[PDB]
Amino acid sequence: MKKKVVIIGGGAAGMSAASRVKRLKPEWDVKVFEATEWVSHAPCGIPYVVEGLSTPDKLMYYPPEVFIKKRGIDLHLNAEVIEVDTGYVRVRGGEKSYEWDYLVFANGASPQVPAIEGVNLKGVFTADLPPDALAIREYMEKYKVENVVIIGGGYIGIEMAEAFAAQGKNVTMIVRGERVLRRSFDKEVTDILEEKLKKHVNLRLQEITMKIEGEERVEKVVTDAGEYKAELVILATGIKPNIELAKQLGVRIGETGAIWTNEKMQTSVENVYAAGDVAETRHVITGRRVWVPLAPAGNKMGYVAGSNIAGKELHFPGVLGTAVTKFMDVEIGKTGLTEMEALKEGYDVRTAFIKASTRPHYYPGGREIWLKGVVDNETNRLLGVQVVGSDILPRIDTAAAMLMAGFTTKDAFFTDLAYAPPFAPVWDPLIVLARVLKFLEH
Amino acid sequence: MKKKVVIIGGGAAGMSAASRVKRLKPEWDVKVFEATEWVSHAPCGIPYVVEGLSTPDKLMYYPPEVFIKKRGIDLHLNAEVIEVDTGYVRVRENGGEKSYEWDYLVFANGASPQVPAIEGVNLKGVFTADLPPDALAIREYMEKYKVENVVIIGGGYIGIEMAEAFAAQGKNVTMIVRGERVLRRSFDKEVTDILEEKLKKHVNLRLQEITMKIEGEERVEKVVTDAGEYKAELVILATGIKPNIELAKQLGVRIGETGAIWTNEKMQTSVENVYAAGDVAETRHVITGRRVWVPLAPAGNKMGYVAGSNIAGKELHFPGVLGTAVTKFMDVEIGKTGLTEMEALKEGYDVRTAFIKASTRPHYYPGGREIWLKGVVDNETNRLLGVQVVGSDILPRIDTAAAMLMAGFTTKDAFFTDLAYAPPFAPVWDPLIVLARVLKFLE
Numbered sequence: 001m002k003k004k005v006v007i008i009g010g011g012a013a014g015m016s017a018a019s020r021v022k023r024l025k026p027e028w029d030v031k032v033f034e035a036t037e038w039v040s041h042a043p044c045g046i047p048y049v050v051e052g053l054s055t056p057d058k059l060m061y062y063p064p065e066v067f068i069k070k071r072g073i074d075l076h077l078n079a080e081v082i083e084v085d086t087g088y089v090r091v092r093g094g095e096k097s098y099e100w101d102y103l104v105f106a107n108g109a110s111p112q113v114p115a116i117e118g119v120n121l122k123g124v125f126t127a128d129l130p131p132d133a134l135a136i137r138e139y140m141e142k143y144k145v146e147n148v149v150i151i152g153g154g155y156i157g158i159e160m161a162e163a164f165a166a167q168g169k170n171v172t173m174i175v176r177g178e179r180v181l182r183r184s185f186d187k188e189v190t191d192i193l194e195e196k197l198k199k200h201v202n203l204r205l206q207e208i209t210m211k212i213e214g215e216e217r218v219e220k221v222v223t224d225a226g227e228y229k230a231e232l233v234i235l236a237t238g239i240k241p242n243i244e245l246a247k248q249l250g251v252r253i254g255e256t257g258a259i260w261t262n263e264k265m266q267t268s269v270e271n272v273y274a275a276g277d278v279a280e281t282r283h284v285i286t287g288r289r290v291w292v293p294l295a296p297a298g299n300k301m302g303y304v305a306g307s308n309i310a311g312k313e314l315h316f317p318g319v320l321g322t323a324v325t326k327f328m329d330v331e332i333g334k335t336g337l338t339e340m341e342a343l344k345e346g347y348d349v350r351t352a353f354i355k356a357s358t359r360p361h362y363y364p365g366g367r368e369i370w371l372k373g374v375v376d377n378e379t380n381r382l383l384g385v386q387v388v389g390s391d392i393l394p395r396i397d398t399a400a401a402m403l404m405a406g407f408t409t410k411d412a413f414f415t416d417l418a419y420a421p422p423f424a425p426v427w428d429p430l431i432v433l434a435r436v437l438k439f440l441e442h
Numbered sequence: 443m444k445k446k447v448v449i450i451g452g453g454a455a456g457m458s459a460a461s462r463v464k465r466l467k468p469e470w471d472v473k474v475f476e477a478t479e480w481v482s483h484a485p486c487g488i489p490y491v492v493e494g495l496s497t498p499d500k501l502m503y504y505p506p507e508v509f510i511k512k513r514g515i516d517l518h519l520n521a522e523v524i525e526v527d528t529g530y531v532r533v534r535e536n537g538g539e540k541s542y543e544w545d546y547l548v549f550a551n552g553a554s555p556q557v558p559a560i561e562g563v564n565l566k567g568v569f570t571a572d573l574p575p576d577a578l579a580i581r582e583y584m585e586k587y588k589v590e591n592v593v594i595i596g597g598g599y600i601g602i603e604m605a606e607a608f609a610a611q612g613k614n615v616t617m618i619v620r621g622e623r624v625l626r627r628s629f630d631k632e633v634t635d636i637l638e639e640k641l642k643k644h645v646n647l648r649l650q651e652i653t654m655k656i657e658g659e660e661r662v663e664k665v666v667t668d669a670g671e672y673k674a675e676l677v678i679l680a681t682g683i684k685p686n687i688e689l690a691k692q693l694g695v696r697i698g699e700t701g702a703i704w705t706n707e708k709m710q711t712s713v714e715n716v717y718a719a720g721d722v723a724e725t726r727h728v729i730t731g732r733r734v735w736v737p738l739a740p741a742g743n744k745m746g747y748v749a750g751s752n753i754a755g756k757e758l759h760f761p762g763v764l765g766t767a768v769t770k771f772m773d774v775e776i777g778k779t780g781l782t783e784m785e786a787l788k789e790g791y792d793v794r795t796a797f798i799k800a801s802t803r804p805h806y807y808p809g810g811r812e813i814w815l816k817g818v819v820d821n822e823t824n825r826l827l828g829v830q831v832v833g834s835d836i837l838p839r840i841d842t843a844a845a846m847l848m849a850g851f852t853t854k855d856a857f858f859t860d861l862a863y864a865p866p867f868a869p870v871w872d873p874l875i876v877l878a879r880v881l882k883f884l885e
């Protein structure tokens with residue numbers, strides 16, 4: 001029998017789920033309901049759209065007709081799913097009902113709303129979806145901005161901060177405690193991003209935002225600490241998964257806050273799946289259920305969800321917590337457990353923090369790179385690697401493979417990594433790190 | 443007790459071994475005999491010093507003072523090992539000869555360029571690019587004599603790296619390649635073709651030519667091949683290299699089928715207490731398990747490390763090599779790991795391949811260059827046999843793939859590996875992941 005598949009949300013995870021199902025089952029009716037004008041879009045591009053490095057149409061991978069005419073997917077744009085119950089969906093010109101044999105929550109995560117005064121003032125913005133990027137640029141046109149404040153010291157906030165310093169503004173970051181990205185990175189890595197950050201940005205640590213002032217336009221921001229002139233505000237205080245439709249069916253919600261899924265991306269409710277930013281996943285090292293709202297996993301989850309619906313078993317092994325960002329000259333990145341995390345999990349750990357060069361001592365253009373590694377004292381296995389400086393991608397990606405596989409410090413050392421003078425030093429920083437840790441054996 | 447450890451060769455392999463031994467056994471007598479004046483040197487920097495992009499003193503990692511004073515190695519510079527016998531080594535240093543007892547011996551005397559049977563190889567103006575003294579000799583010749591036209595006899599990596607060194611200096615460069623294509627021995631056609639496009643535009647690329655003779659006055663002026671003549675004031679012979687095994691043979695040391703000194707995981711040779719590390723040594727291949735010869739720097743260094751540890755009674759095993767290597771001509775990056783399609787087929791594998799094109803950034807973020815990937819896969823097990831990468835930003839794809847191959851990843855293992863994404867780094871689907879997907883998990 002043909003079967004009716006319904007997908008809520010037309011982002012990365014949603015279309016990956018949509019494509020996969022139709023690809024495997026062309027005779028099946030695959031509907032996607034997206035609330036906005038946007039499909040196959042990238043929230044990752046926003047900062048760079050706003051910076052103006054590029055345009056907002058380039059936050060699409062594929063246009064609608066590629067999905068409808070070229071891939072046979074019944075794509076409903078401007079369509080908001082408002083209710084769900086067993087076997088039925090309710091959507092909004094018009095408010096119609098649809099039946100499903102399978103359901104995918106490819107539903108994403110909306111930004112967290114801190115309840116303080118002036119949050120609703122023309123002038124205050126939160127960066128999540130592509131319509132937000134156009135709204136900020138449509139604003140900087142209708143008004144004249146020179147002072148910008150950013151509440152949040154995470155990555156979303158840093159990328160937005162950079163997106164304004166490049167446009168030559170007086171930017172102020174207000175983070176709620178002792179360091180930037182304290183939740184995800186360790187101090188000795190975070191310090192090196194901050195040296196560069198302090199300089200190009202008014203970094204205000206250990207502060208809480210109290211109110212936002214203005215008329216109908218924003219004009220000032222007050223914190224427990226001091227006042228700052230501001231004509232535009234970005235709020236990046238974290239995000240939370242859109243779980244409100246999920247509960248509508250008493251789908252299990254994870255310790256994490258996101259929708260509980262298994263290896264097949266199935267939920268606690270039969271024929272109901274979940275993928276992307278709404279979905280809680282598994283950690284590859286730890287085995288703990290964890291929430292890591294990032295793009296590559298989002299897509300893979302959609303791919304995995306699509307496959308199981310179309311009746312070919314596939315497992316998603318989980319995630320490593322691999323992530324990477326940048327402030328100007330400085331590349332920041334991790335994969336696996338941070339020292340803090342590894343401690344929280346009750347591991348017995350040793351660590352190492354080294355500096356190296358990015359090129360051999362002869363070939364020019366050699367820049368600095370720092371690496372912190374975390375190792376389990378009992379097994380010698382790597383638990384995580386953090387890298388900062390220049391040219392950190394080969395290291396992070398490489399270490400991610402090694403972790404996936406459960407490499408030891410010794411396994412890493414003898415791995416045949418490449419060397420040429422225009423590429424890396426003789427002793428690759430990753431294998432240097434792995435040597436400084438040592439291979440202990442009772 | 444307090445053993446005597448003698449190491450022939452002061453390159454990466456020798457110094458790694460000497461350092462390791464002394465580090466584990468500080469009460470031991472450790473001697474390094476190096477023929478030249480250079481210790482801890484980088485022959486890998488010869489092309490870049492020739493280009494003038496770097497000074498020669500930059501080829502040394504540590505000054506010899508560090509090994510002697512700071513580490514305790516009895517380093518003997520300008521000292522050549524002439525004969526080897528069980529227990530003894532004959533060395534020529536201060537014009538004369540002398541004798542040294544060894545309890546442990548390491549061959550780290552590397553590999554030297556193959557001397558071709560052409561007439562006129564010994565004219566002045568003809569150089570080999572193998573050791574640091576060569577790089578000086580090349581600059582000093584360009585200083586003493588006017589050079590406009592440069593001819594490279596090559597095809598392989600050194601050749602291309604030497605060819606580039608002369609081009610960006612404005613010189614007129616010609617490459618003589620025996621048979622169909624550049625780098626034909628180590629890469630597949632569809633990979634080298636992309637480099638070759640870039641080569642021909644900045645090089646007089648001459649394929650399927652056997653250089654017959656090098657002619658000139660007292661010094662070089664022309665190169666004659668069975669294809670024709672080429673005006674040349676300077677010649678680089680880079681037709682391949684051979685392991686220095688002639689003094690191993692005196693000891694009765696087993697030589698592997700590759701031509702290099704046979705070893706095991708411990709870097710031990712056929713002869714008791716005798717070791718070999720670096721470009722002299724034959725090692726294991728991580729995938730095939732076959733004996734292989736890959737004269738490259740990171741392996742040579744680890745081989746020295748491993749040899750040192752075993753001499754000093756701390757057992758360690760070198761797992762072998764993947765055939766991982768990387769080069770660049772201009773802004774074209776070329777690199778491989780594992781087996782090519784040709785190697786795999788030669789080894790009798792049931793093989794499927796894929797060749798894809800992608801970008802280094804997403805279509806929003808700018809600066810996106812082109813990247814091409816080739817993957818070889820075993821049909822029966824779904825495991826990656828090898829990956830070749832060409833274009834821009836290829837280091838992540840090779841290093842990551844190397845780890846995967848080292849470990850025995852399948853295409854599905856590769857596909858589901860948590861690789862990093864941010865716009866200034868890569869596209870949402872890393873080109874490696876696309877390769878793994880286009881390859882397929884057929885079972």
Ligand SMILES: Cc1cc2nc3c(=O)[nH]c(=O)nc-3n(C[C@H](O)[C@H](O)[C@H](O)COP(=O)(O)OP(=O)(O)OC[C@H]3O[C@@H](n4cnc5c(N)ncnc54)[C@H](O)[C@@H]3O)c2cc1C
Binds near residue numbers: 012293865
């Ligand atoms: C500014 C920013 C920068 C980022 N940078 C990176 C990065 O560098 N690297 C990285 O890996 N990740 C990054 N991410 C995260 C990445 O964008 C997400 O993890 C990924 O896009 C998740 O895809 P998704 O389809 O699951 O959710 P989304 O991409 O958010 O798609 C969900 C869609 O569902 C729609 N929807 C919501 N509710 C309904 C409803 N009730 N009815 C119908 N439709 C609905 C929404 O309109 C939305 O379009 C970034 C995110 C942001 C916000």
Ligand SMILES: Cc1cc2nc3c(=O)[nH]c(=O)nc-3n(C[C@H](O)[C@H](O)[C@H](O)COP(=O)(O)OP(=O)(O)OC[C@H]3O[C@@H](n4cnc5c(N)ncnc54)[C@H](O)[C@@H]3O)c2cc1C
Binds near residue numbers: 452453480489553
């Ligand atoms: C032009 C060029 C470019 C290269 N580029 C790269 C690259 O990009 N990446 C890479 O991984 N590898 C590269 N290599 C290879 C790399 O240099 C070698 O694999 C590495 O140096 C091997 O170290 P080794 O000590 O075994 O040999 P060597 O570094 O050559 O050391 C051997 C030493 O032993 C000495 N010796 C020889 N005979 C005697 C004797 N009779 N008595 C005493 N001493 C003796 C020699 O003088 C020599 O200094 C390149 C090589 C060349 C020539």
Ligand SMILES: CC(C)(COP(=O)(O)OP(=O)(O)OC[C@H]1O[C@@H](n2cnc3c(N)ncnc32)[C@H](O)[C@@H]1OP(=O)(O)O)[C@@H](O)C(=O)NCCC(=O)NCCS
Binds near residue numbers: 041043060
């Ligand atoms: C593109 C998207 C819809 C997924 O669709 P997908 O079909 O799984 O991925 P592709 O369109 O690239 O793949 C189509 C086919 O081409 C092949 N392919 C992809 N790239 C290729 C390449 N460069 N060379 C050769 N083949 C390629 C794939 O193998 C696939 O084959 P298959 O259908 O048999 O599996 C989804 O990832 C998306 O919405 N992306 C944009 C949004 C986003 O990811 N943003 C990032 C979050 S901020």
Ligand SMILES: CC(C)(COP(=O)(O)OP(=O)(O)OC[C@H]1O[C@@H](n2cnc3c(N)ncnc32)[C@H](O)[C@@H]1OP(=O)(O)O)[C@@H](O)C(=O)NCCC(=O)NCCS
Binds near residue numbers: 354458481487503
């Ligand atoms: C340098 C050489 C002698 C090896 O020496 P080594 O002692 O084994 O390696 P290092 O010099 O880095 O040793 C430094 C020590 O400090 C440690 N260290 C700590 N932090 C470090 C850092 N951030 N970077 C490098 N080493 C660090 C190393 O782990 C090592 O520890 P160990 O003594 O306990 O083993 C050898 O590689 C050589 O001669 N190289 C020159 C030629 C070459 O590199 N290649 C030739 C062709 S390109």
